[PDB]
Amino acid sequence: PEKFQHILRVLNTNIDGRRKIAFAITAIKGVGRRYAHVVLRKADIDLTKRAGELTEDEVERVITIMQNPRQYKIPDWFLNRQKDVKDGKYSQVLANGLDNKLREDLERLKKIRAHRGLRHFWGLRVRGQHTKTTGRRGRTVG
């Protein structure tokens, strides 16, 4: 039964109606599986059926409950970003805005030109890691 619809498009990523609701949503960046099983329960809907069985009325509510999480009483610590830095607030970042935000913080750390941006620009590991036996790839030997 329930032949009504299948694969659909939502914001910035195409989501299949093939998979279960929570796991389907995770494909959108800035949303993990842990972030989705919350947001579905705040929306007060089943997670025990497929994503192709949601109606347009329902999914319209999903994105609102997602993009104003503080106003639907999901805690601040449970967000991606707490006080971004130089923006002054708690925030939740989703697919195409995530990349834009990310590229800024790279640019910032070469603006000031800390140790960070130099390691980024040289293409070497940021965090405390040995590079002597790591990475390889490689070739060109003596």
Added chain:
Amino acid sequence: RDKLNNLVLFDKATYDKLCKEVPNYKLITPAVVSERLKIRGSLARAALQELLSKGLIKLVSKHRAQVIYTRNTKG
């Protein structure tokens, strides 16, 4: 790995075959329903639960990782 796809919703033909496989089959597990039809294993799980409510099949054994079903005990 291979490429394969299964149906995650029911159709006409799935339901009709589902009613007629019963007297012909001694073993019915969701795995065997996966092969004889093109249907997902969790879909096939619940499809057999429906039949048991009708009394077409009979449960004979149960486990976490398996469920077994039999005909009508008419041979």
Added chain:
Amino acid sequence: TPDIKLFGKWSTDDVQINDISLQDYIAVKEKYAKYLPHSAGRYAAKRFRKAQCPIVERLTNSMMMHGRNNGKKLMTVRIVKHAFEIIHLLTGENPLQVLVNAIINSGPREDSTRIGRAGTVRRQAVDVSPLRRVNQAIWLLCTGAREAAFRNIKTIAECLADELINAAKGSSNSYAIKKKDELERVAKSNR
């Protein structure tokens, strides 16, 4: 007899051995019946001491390999209860008679070995012990189901029970009866 133990559902009488060359190396009914295939066991410390413990127990032992199923003998008995159940429904025979046939049909009767002569490979065909036949036959059919369920929707229970049907029959659509004849095909050649 008036206190005869089943498996909790299966008779250990009405179990035939269709060789005189493998009876008294199959253990299934002299007094070797038990409700479970788990024991402390003695399988060692004397050479003739392996043949004195049940076939059903041996089966549970030999299907727990590949480095992550060792020390999980309790899970293995779960697989055996489903196996026999499926075999009995599927064909109608008492599922111990199935297993005994499956062992008898799968055991190789001649095998080859190595011999070093002139610095070049020569091979010699030789025969086999009854105790060897049993050890080989239990290994081979278990290898089929172990391989099959290694990326399939089908569970290990389903695979194993299917493999005992095609072994117990002379069908030659199994991993066991295939490889049995392969060995003999070599043994003819370098005989």
Added chain:
Amino acid sequence: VTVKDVNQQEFVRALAAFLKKSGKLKVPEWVDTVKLAKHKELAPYDENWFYTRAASTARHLYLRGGAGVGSMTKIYGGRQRNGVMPSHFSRGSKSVARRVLQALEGLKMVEKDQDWGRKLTPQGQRDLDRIAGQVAAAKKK
């Protein structure tokens, strides 16, 4: 009967149901944001987890002589996968268990008894054994 005489996997799943029927318990605000132990990777599959954990809590108090918030956590802790690093043991949350015990105590089926630690109230012990025989009466052990 004594709760020992009946199955215990069945006992709890009926004791949880008893509470939820009777309007019993006071439930925290946090109930859809809760990992439910440190070592867990995901939130509960069940929304009735508060009722469920209160069942298992009250059962243990009947058996053992009762002990504080620390011991309850130790009973619940399990194995923590660490990815590339090999496993370790850990003990779960505290503030969930401290609300569980306090919610039970609000109905006065538990109480901070002698030698500073919770013990189950005689009224509490009465109610366990009351539904304990209902389990054996129902199905049949």
Added chain:
Amino acid sequence: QQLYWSHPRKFGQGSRSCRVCSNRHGLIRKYGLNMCRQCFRQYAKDIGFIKLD
């Protein structure tokens, strides 16, 4: 001396030593011992331990 002649060492390696030569690293802290493993062996018989297994 004055306000510089020392830097606080009151934890870690540089604030413990051993009582038979003042050597560091390889030493046994356990039971209140404070003996370096090379020299511990030579005073092993001298009341302390004896081999048995």
Added chain:
Amino acid sequence: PLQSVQVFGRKKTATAVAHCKRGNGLIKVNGRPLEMIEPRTLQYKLLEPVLLLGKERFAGVDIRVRVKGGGHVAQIYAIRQSISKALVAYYQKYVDEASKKEIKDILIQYDRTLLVADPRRCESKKFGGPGARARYQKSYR
């Protein structure tokens, strides 16, 4: 007189002290029925002596057991070994020789260390390898 004889069972560190006292029925282990004890897949095993001997050797006794030590498996063999041995000792001491002689013969037929204790216990790890007999890899050049 006050009929009470006590026995124990062993299997690789797991004591199970089973007193056999005059009565009828009501065999328990740890103050619980032995109709369910919780792996319950090896459930047929501890029941095995009772089932095989019939109910007519257990027609005048209450046997109860306390346990400690071992894992889930080894406990089952300990409790089985104790209740079996308990029965034998009771008949040798308050009834007569020929009473227990029959029962002894029945058990030792399907012996599974039902009257003796497994000697085997773990062997110590000695350095230069994991385990008690395995060795780390050794590389040449």
Added chain:
Amino acid sequence: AIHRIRITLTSRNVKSLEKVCADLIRGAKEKNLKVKGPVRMPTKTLRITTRKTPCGEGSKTWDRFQMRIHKRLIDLHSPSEIVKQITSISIEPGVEVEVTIADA
């Protein structure tokens, strides 16, 4: 007065210990003070497991050392004077003794 006095003995040598325990049980029984025999307590293992080589080289070997201490205690109930009398006599080897004021 009559005080429940507990005499703890402790040593590293089981022979030297035990005979001195026997002496203290004797001196008590001689005056019929209704003493309690030795209550032998669990022997405790001090272990040290270390390299045999100074400066690593050659096969990796270790060496298990152990010292076993022994504890045991005799409970008396008698006047504290006659206790300190019988305690101080008939002790020659290196064995420690600890007298207690009172016990419940």
Added chain:
RNA sequence: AACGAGACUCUGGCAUGCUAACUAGUUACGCGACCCCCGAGCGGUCGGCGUCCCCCAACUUCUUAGAGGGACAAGUGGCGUUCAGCCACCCGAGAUUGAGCAAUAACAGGUCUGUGAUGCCCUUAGAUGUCGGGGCUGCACGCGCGCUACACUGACUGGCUCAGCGUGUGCCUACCCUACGCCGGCAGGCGCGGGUAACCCGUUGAACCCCAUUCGUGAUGGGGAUCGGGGAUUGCAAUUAUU
């Protein structure tokens, strides 16, 4: 004749015999108290389930540690020169459970960076003996020991259920193991209490295992590398990200 071998020492498997136990238990009631009819019965009474109550009760099977005993190819049947022994079997725990200790002679083996063991040579106030900030982690390659994975004999979420060797502040110049109560999603904070330890932490209510949900053969929820943002704790200080 001697050394090494075995003998020996330690360790493990066998004692309802001996010795004796509020820092170890059991049993027995007395129980009174709680509890349910939970069982015979009726809800009484009798019994069951554990805790407080237990004793100037009884006992030491279970826990503990000392002295002893036990195992010898001893017995039986084969085989052997009928010797030394060997194989099978009875009895029963099979003479072999595992370590420690370990000879003569040798190596231009390793260690002057354990040594206030040590020869000789070198340096010694512009010091090779002290403070501050840096490095031993720097990466086109190569090699070795390991760890985690490639799933369904699985993962995930609930529920059920079992151990053993140890260790601990009162020590160096300064520090321990933690119960319990409260606050916090978590990391953690905070208030009180015990333990020199068969006494307190801890009847160490550990994991795999076990039972029921969910996922469905899909680089998938397998895998968690890499990496962004934020919160804690240790320290004088955490930048190259201590945890």
